A paper describes a structure:
Other regions in the spike S2 subunit, such as the stem helix and the segment encompassing residues 815-823 adjacent to the fusion peptide, are highly conserved across sarbecoviruses and are recognized by broadly reactive antibodies, providing hope that vaccines targeting these epitopes could offer protection against both current and emergent viruses. Here we employ computational modeling to design scaffolded immunogens that display the spike 815-823 peptide and the stem helix epitopes without the distracting and immunodominant receptor binding domain. Unlike peptide-based immunogens that can sample diverse epitope conformations, epitope scaffolds are meant to present only the antibody-bound conformation of the target epitope on their surface, which typically leads to higher antibody affinity and the elicitation of antibodies specific for the structure of the target epitope.
Given the failure of side chain grafting to produce epitope scaffolds that engage the CC40.8 mAb, we employed an alternative design technique, termed backbone grafting. Here, rather than transplanting only the epitope-specific residues onto a preexisting scaffold backbone which is otherwise unchanged, an entire region of the parent scaffold backbone is replaced with the backbone of the secondary structure containing the desired epitope. This allows the grafting of more complex epitopes that have no existing structural match, such as the CC40.8 S2-helix epitope. Next, we optimized the sequence of the S2hlx-Ex designs using ProteinMPNN21, a recently described deep learning algorithm that takes a protein structure as input and generates amino acid sequences that are predicted to generate the same fold. Analysis of a high-resolution (2.3 Å) crystal structure of unbound S2hlx-Ex19 further confirmed the successful transplantation of the CC40.8 mAb epitope. As expected, the grafted epitope region in S2hlx-Ex19 diverged considerably from the backbone region it replaced in the parent scaffold (backbone RMSD = 5.8 Å), with the epitope adopting a more exposed conformation that allows for antibody engagement. This conformational change was likely facilitated by introducing two aromatic residues (Tyr62 and Phe66) under the epitope helix, which effectively pushed the epitope segment away from the rest of the protein core. Interestingly, the epitope conformation on S2hlx-Ex19 was almost identical to that present on the prefusion stem helix, rather than the more extended one induced by CC40.8. Nevertheless, given the high affinity of S2hlx-Ex19 for CC40.8 (KD = 6.7 nM), it is likely that the antibody can readily induce the necessary conformation upon binding. Interestingly, the stem helix immunogen S2hlx-Ex19, which bound with affinities for CC40.8 and S2P6 similar to those of the native spike, displays the epitope at the N-terminus of the scaffold.
Numbering used by the authors: 3 to 131
The structure:
Amino acid sequence: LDSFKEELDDYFKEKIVKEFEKLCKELISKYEVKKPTPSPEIKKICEYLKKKHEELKDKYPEEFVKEIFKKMWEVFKKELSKQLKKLGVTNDGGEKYKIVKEDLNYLVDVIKSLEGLSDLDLNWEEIWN
C-alpha cells in the first residue's frame, strides 16, 4: 500500500536520525577545538556517515537518502552550534575558528563525495548565530 509505505518511510527516517542525533550529542559535547585536524570526533562522525550511506544506498531510493542526509546535517549543525557557544568559539579569524573551519571542510567533502549527495546545501555559517 501507498498510504502506509509513506508512514513507515517516515518511521525508519525518524529512527535513523535519532541514532545519529545521539551519536553527535555524545561526541560533540566532548569536542574541544585543537589540532590535529581532522579532529577525532569529526572523523568518527565521518566514518558513521560513510557507513550509513552505503548501508542506506542498498535499500532506499535516491531522493530518500538525500532527505535523511539533509536531516543529519541539520542535527549536526545544531549540536555543534551549542558546543561552540559552550566553549566561546566564534567566527573571529583566530586559530580556534580556523580549526573548526578545517574540520567542517573535511566533513563537507566527505558528505559531498558520497554518491548522490554532491549537490547538497552544506553551508554552516549560521552555527555562529
